[PDB]
Design a protein around this nucleic acid. Sequence first.
DNA 1: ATCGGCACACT
DNA 2: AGTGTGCC
Length: 424
Amino acid sequence: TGQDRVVALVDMDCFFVQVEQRQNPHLRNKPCAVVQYKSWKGGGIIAVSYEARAFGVTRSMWADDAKKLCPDLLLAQVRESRGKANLTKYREASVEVMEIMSRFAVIERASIDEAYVDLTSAVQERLQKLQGQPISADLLPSTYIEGLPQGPEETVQKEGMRKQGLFQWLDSLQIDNLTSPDLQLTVGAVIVEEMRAAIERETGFQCSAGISHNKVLAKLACGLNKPNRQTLVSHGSVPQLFSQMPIRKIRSLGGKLGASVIEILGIEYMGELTQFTESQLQSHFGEKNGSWLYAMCRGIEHDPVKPRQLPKTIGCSKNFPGKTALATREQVQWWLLQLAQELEERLTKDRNDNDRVATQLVVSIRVQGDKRLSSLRRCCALTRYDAHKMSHDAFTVIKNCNTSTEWSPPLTMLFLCATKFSAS
DNA sequence: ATCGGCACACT
DNA sequence: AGTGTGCC
Ligand SMILES: Nc1nc2c(ncn2[C@H]2C[C@H](O)[C@@H](COP(=O)(O)NP(=O)(O)OP(=O)(O)O)O2)c(=O)[nH]1
Ligand SMILES: [Mg+2]
Ligand SMILES: [Mg+2]
């Protein structure tokens, strides 16, 4: 079936922008982006409001270039600490949202601004409490039903379409059977409406949600009606939805694997995957992937929503690209120390707030003219949350790397990460 | 010089 | 353990 569970995916809209907009009222309802490291081309853009997007502004764009596209664009700068970007403000805002969501159901923190929710149980409970009662259209004020309306002047308006689709969906719904997968999705959507309302009221942040039977579909659904809307993707909408759906849009298919599927199989849409047998797919892409693709193109995925609200690892890194690369011993030690200081500050907060300690410290370095993203990876024991010792240990482990009071080759990157957390 | 940052599969 | 991928 693949209609066994109810899963939702919630994602904040232009999250960093919202954080800056809440803190500054002036940036509200204006085109704006968030940038870091202004010196170079005005800084790199990592977050763009929807007002700015209408002008074509995107992340990974230089602020100066963005200005050319959008003359009145307002910019917000990431806090800078110890010579590197500090994402503390956004991490704290993130916790706020996660905490509200946690109240409604067990969630999986997928990223800083999105979380997966398994509502299977909550939906069942709700059904019992409102048992025998129809679902009013009023309960789903921002819900879109994928694939509707269908068949037969309101439609010209976006809102008109949404209302008509929802009416058709609700009208079709049979209150009589609790078991119906579609009914459970509708109830789950009501819960997500309530959850989204709570988030907006308590944090002031707007967000979008996708409600479906699995995480991949939920994610896909979420992206359909951004921003400030939630989309319900039923099992039945999948054939029509997937039929013109590019392969790269499915989660985890945006990279090389997706490209292999397209290149090898000679298809461009998700639906086209249905013709191939499971065995064929497994032979081309492996047993695990083959199984996943065969099931996925039919709208079925079984990956569980992990009950995890905390990051497994905590790391900080800095790039020194091109000329800026560190060529001296003293430089490497100084930067290692800076990294260690931020790490210690985050670690202490983690120990006090989450009551756990990290057992392993990981050091990563890159050198000039290296094809590999990570030039080297090393780990050492992390006995105490002390910056001086941590930097010294990292240096001790990577001291052997230098080929030549000078360092050679110069280092493109420094990376420290704390891992292997244990209860304390 | 599109940065810093997470999780996972594979060996 | 260390490497490589994919995403936010
Ligand atoms: N440094 C950095 N931060 C990033 C990057 N990509 C995203 N972020 C940070 C900054 C982002 O604000 C935040 C959330 O990631 P999204 O959900 O993928 N995009 P948003 O919520 O902005 O918009 P919407 O969801 O409505 O399209 O993660 C990046 O490539 N680099
Ligand atoms: Mg977002
Ligand atoms: Mg996101």
